[PDB]
């Protein structure tokens, strides 16, 4: 019922502006404050400000005053937040909310980068030749230098799914890098094939890297 | 602005345990203290407002208390769906402010990391770089240190770490640590080692290889 609909994500370039939308449904937002909050992984949560749709009254966090401009559209029951002069400092998840009897949107992940669509390089991860001993063995794929997210990584076309660890992508430079591990029984590999399937939609790339033993 | 001090930042508990999270404000906030819960998919819900009022649909195991500057959220008997990130917000004065959060996780018994080190591929070497990676898998607790050594000397630049969230099945944590060098730098040295330092052992778990074996 009470819902606040926000777009999932947007990629914008530094210096541009962005107008984030927050469409309310299940209630008429006239007499509710519509708040905006910024969430970026290191830093905590920061309240940007709120607007009251009925008379447009606003209360801002001084820190965000010409970064953020809040408006409303009464006919569409929609709240907006424009972010201008976007910098890397502005990449984050932006939520909208109502108050009192608060409900929050799902949040819009905004990325501000001037990086260009780069396909990943997929490297095999296998123990130095043989296998550092044991009952089981761990393999892997290192997916480096792509943009933008995401990359879809599977093992043996989804047939190999348990025993896998696929780490969150990390931003090194302006590009992304991710890694994934699979642990199998030692007797199974090499004997049974193990290939990592990498797909990078943005660059419309699909790569299959079979993991086999080699030396250095 | 009113600063909110939330503690603890992290807490592990077992299903059925009582859990208490606290927020302290630097000024009186007149009972306007709200507790939010956030799930990994980024969903956020307001659980409790005005210190102790449960929002619509919140289960009766939740409750809040406090006044003045000192507030608390309690879960009498933890359930799995409560494993989440919690944060308070004072609503007693503008601009509104948030506490720093409490990551509530599942307690399990310590488990040493399974450590694996991997040499650079010829694919990467042909392009001018050399990445050495080490997986520090399925360990508990969450604090863990990885140390990279080249030729026995410590190496800090060029390391890129990533951590999984707590596993839904074994409650363990995993981490990826990648040391990236240029190919010519990688060719100037011989031994490459990762040392995993975790509370499950007094001595680090060390994995290494020499531009050379097998």
């Amino acid at each position: 019922q009470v819902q606040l609909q926000q777009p999932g994500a947007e990629l914008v370039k530094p210096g541009a502006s962005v107008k984030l939308s927050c469409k309310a449904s299940g209630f008429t937002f006239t007499n509710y404050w519509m708040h905006w909050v910024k969430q970026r992984p290191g830093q905590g949560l920061e309240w940007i400000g709120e607007i009251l749709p009925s008379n447009g009254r606003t209360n801002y966090n001084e820190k965000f005053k010409t970064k953020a401009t809040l408006t409303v559209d009464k006919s569409s029951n929609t709240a907006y937040m424009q972010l201008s002069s976007l910098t890397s400092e502005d990449s984050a998840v932006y939520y909208c909310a109502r108050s009192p009897s608060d409900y929050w949107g799902q949040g819009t992940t905004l990325t501000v980068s001037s990086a260009k669509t780069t396909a990943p390089s997929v490297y095999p991860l296998a123990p130095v030749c043989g296998d550092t001993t044991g009952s089981s063995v761990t393999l892997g794929c290192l997916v480096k230098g792509y943009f933008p997210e995401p990359v879809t990584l599977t093992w043996n076309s989804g047939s190999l799914s348990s025993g896998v660890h696929t780490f969150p992508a990390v931003l090194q430079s302006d590009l992304y890098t991710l890694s994934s591990s699979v642990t199998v029984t030692s007797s199974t590999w090499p004997s049974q094939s193990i290939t990592c399937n990498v797909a990078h939609p943005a660059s419309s790339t699909k790569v299959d890297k079979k993991i086999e033993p080699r030396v250095p | 602005d009113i600063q909110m001090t939330q503690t603890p930042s992290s807490l592990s508990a077992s299903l059925g345990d009582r859990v208490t999270i606290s927020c302290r404000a630097s000024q009186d906030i007149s009972h306007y203290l709200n507790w939010f819960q956030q799930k990994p998919d980024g969903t956020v819900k307001l659980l409790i407002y005005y210190t102790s009022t449960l929002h619509s649909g919140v289960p009766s195991r939740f409750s809040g208390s406090g006044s003045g500057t000192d507030y608390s959220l309690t879960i009498s008997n933890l359930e799995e769906e409560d494993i989440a990130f919690y944060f308070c917000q004072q609503g007693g004065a503008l601009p509104f402010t948030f506490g720093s959060g409490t990551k509530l996780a599942i307690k399990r018994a310590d488990a040493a990391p399974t450590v694996s080190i991997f040499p650079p591929s010829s694919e990467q070497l042909t392009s001018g770089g050399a990445s050495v990676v080490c997986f520090l898998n399925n360990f508990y607790p969450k604090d863990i240190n990885v140390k990279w050594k080249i030729d026995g000397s410590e190496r800090q630049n060029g390391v890129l770490d990533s951590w999984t969230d707590q596993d839904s099945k074994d409650s363990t944590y995993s981490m990826s640590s990648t040391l990236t060098l240029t190919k010519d730098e990688y060719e100037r040295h011989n031994s490459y080692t990762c040392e995993a330092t975790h509370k499950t052992s007094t001595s680090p778990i060390v994995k290494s290889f020499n531009r050379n074996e097998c």
Partner: peptide
């Protein structure tokens, strides 16, 4: 009962 003083 509300979540913020100005609600």
């Amino acid at each position: 009962v509300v979540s913020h003083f100005n609600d």
